Amino acid sequence: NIFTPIEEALEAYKNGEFLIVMDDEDRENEGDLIMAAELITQEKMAFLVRYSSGYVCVPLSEERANQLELPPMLAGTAYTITCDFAEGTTTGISAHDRALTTRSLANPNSKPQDFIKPGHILPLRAVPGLLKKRRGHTEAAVQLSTLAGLQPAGVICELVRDEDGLMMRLDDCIQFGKKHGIKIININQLVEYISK
Amino acid sequence: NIFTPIEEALEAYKNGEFLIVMDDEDRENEGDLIMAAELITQEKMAFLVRYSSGYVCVPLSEERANQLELPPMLAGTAYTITCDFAEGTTTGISAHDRALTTRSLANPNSKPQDFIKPGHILPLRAVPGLLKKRRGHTEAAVQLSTLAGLQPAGVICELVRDEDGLMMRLDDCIQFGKKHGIKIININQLVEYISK
Numbered sequence: 001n002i003f004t005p006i007e008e009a010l011e012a013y014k015n016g017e018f019l020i021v022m023d024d025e026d027r028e029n030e031g032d033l034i035m036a037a038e039l040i041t042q043e044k045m046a047f048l049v050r051y052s053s054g055y056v057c058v059p060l061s062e063e064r065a066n067q068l069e070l071p072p073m074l075a076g077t078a079y080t081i082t083c084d085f086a087e088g089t090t091t092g093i094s095a096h097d098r099a100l101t102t103r104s105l106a107n108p109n110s111k112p113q114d115f116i117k118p119g120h121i122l123p124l125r126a127v128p129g130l131l132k133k134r135r136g137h138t139e140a141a142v143q144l145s146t147l148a149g150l151q152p153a154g155v156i157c158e159l160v161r162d163e164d165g166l167m168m169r170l171d172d173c174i175q176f177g178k179k180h181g182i183k184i185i186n187i188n189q190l191v192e193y194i195s196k
Numbered sequence: 197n198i199f200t201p202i203e204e205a206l207e208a209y210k211n212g213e214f215l216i217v218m219d220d221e222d223r224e225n226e227g228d229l230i231m232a233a234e235l236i237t238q239e240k241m242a243f244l245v246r247y248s249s250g251y252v253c254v255p256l257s258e259e260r261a262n263q264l265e266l267p268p269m270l271a272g273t274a275y276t277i278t279c280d281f282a283e284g285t286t287t288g289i290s291a292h293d294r295a296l297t298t299r300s301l302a303n304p305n306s307k308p309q310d311f312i313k314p315g316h317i318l319p320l321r322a323v324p325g326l327l328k329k330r331r332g333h334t335e336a337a338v339q340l341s342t343l344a345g346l347q348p349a350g351v352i353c354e355l356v357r358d359e360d361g362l363m364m365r366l367d368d369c370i371q372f373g374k375k376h377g378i379k380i381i382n383i384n385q386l387v388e389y390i391s392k
């Protein structure tokens with residue numbers, strides 16, 4: 001009565017919807033908004049920033065990050081050097097620009113020289129094996145996109161309360177999901193699905 | 197009737213208030229919230245994140261960044277590798293943690309080893325000479341802290357509209373300043389003050 005079955009969640013994700021993702025069923029877990037990188041629009045990025053910490057990250061597989069020449073920031077959340085997609089962006093930080101950069105990171109046709117570094121988007125490197133190797137939200141994002149038949153790239157950010165800026169625990173996430181019509185799932189639920 | 201005189205603005209800044217900073221008087225400029233790094237509290241960081249892009253940056257002088265061993269992210273906005281103050285933080289992204297890290301970056305007693313890299317705060321390197329060399333918001337932040345007799349460190353983020361996520365131009369910034377009791381100034385105005 002709280003979490004959406006994975007297969008229904010995958011269709012919503014496939015249809016460009018966000019999913020609220022928790023680690024497991026614990027009430028003290030803090031929620032994250034996650035959606036397909038290739039499907040995030042200016043409006044959806046505006047939504048993500050409005051209700052989150054604003055430290056928007058874009059999980060990519062290590063193979064894809066290597067292809068785009070996005071090395072670890074430092075030669076626990078594997079940040080790569082930040083970036084902006086050059087063509088079509090100005091300030092880089094706008095909802096329009098961050099959305100374009102995110103879709104560009106997912107686009108199979110994008111090339112290393114298409115991006116400016118540093119930038120305003122934080123790409124993350126998901127480990128090979130995804131959730132079977134590391135149960136992080138980074139691996140969850142790429143796993144969701146993979147299961148959805150989309151490019152192995154996602155975009156995420158932490159939900160925050162408007163009242164005091166505290167991260168949203170399960171109860172508030174359930175309220176947020178009902179108010180905005182967003183389904184909720186948890187990583188353990190996802191691991192169970194891909195394991196049997 | 198729009199911009200606050202610099203000396204009055206400095207007293208507000210010295211008193212831990214934010215200042216809305218524009219490049220000059222143009223109505224098309226987008227506004228930034230800027231305040232002293234050493235004075236940002238959990239509540240003030242929550243406020244900043246709530247009404248901004250969330251990509252919170254911490255302007256520091258190049259000399260201070262060198263002392264803290266925060267090299268340029270890559271060898272335009274001069275980002276250094278990101279960081280979190282180790283002691284007292286957990287998730288690093290929380291208003292509490294980002295505020296603590298920010299105050300720590302300003303604290304002259306902080307040491308290189310006190311921080312974990314990468315992190316959730318984006319330090320910026322202000323060029324020597326500040327606003328007389330580069331009229332960026334980075335230099336403006338450090339300049340304000342310097343003129344206020346505080347540590348050469350500031351914290352900033354771009355104001356964004358709740359309705360559509362678009363950055364706040366002058367008109368909206370004036371409305372924001374009046375609604376929240378925050379003074380507005382512009383960089384050209386600051387350059388005039390430090391010159392002559």
Ligand SMILES: O=C(CO)[C@H](O)[C@H](O)COP(=O)(O)O
Pocket residue numbers: 032057076077078124135136137138139156157158
């Ligand atoms: O979701 C998050 C924190 O909860 C953030 O997006 C983080 O940058 C990536 O998460 P993780 O380190 O679990 O892969």
Ligand SMILES: O=C(CO)[C@H](O)[C@H](O)COP(=O)(O)O
Pocket residue numbers: 228253272273274320331332333334335352353354
């Ligand atoms: O203020 C800003 C947007 O304008 C940002 O905080 C930026 O990181 C610093 O700006 P600048 O490159 O002008 O020093």
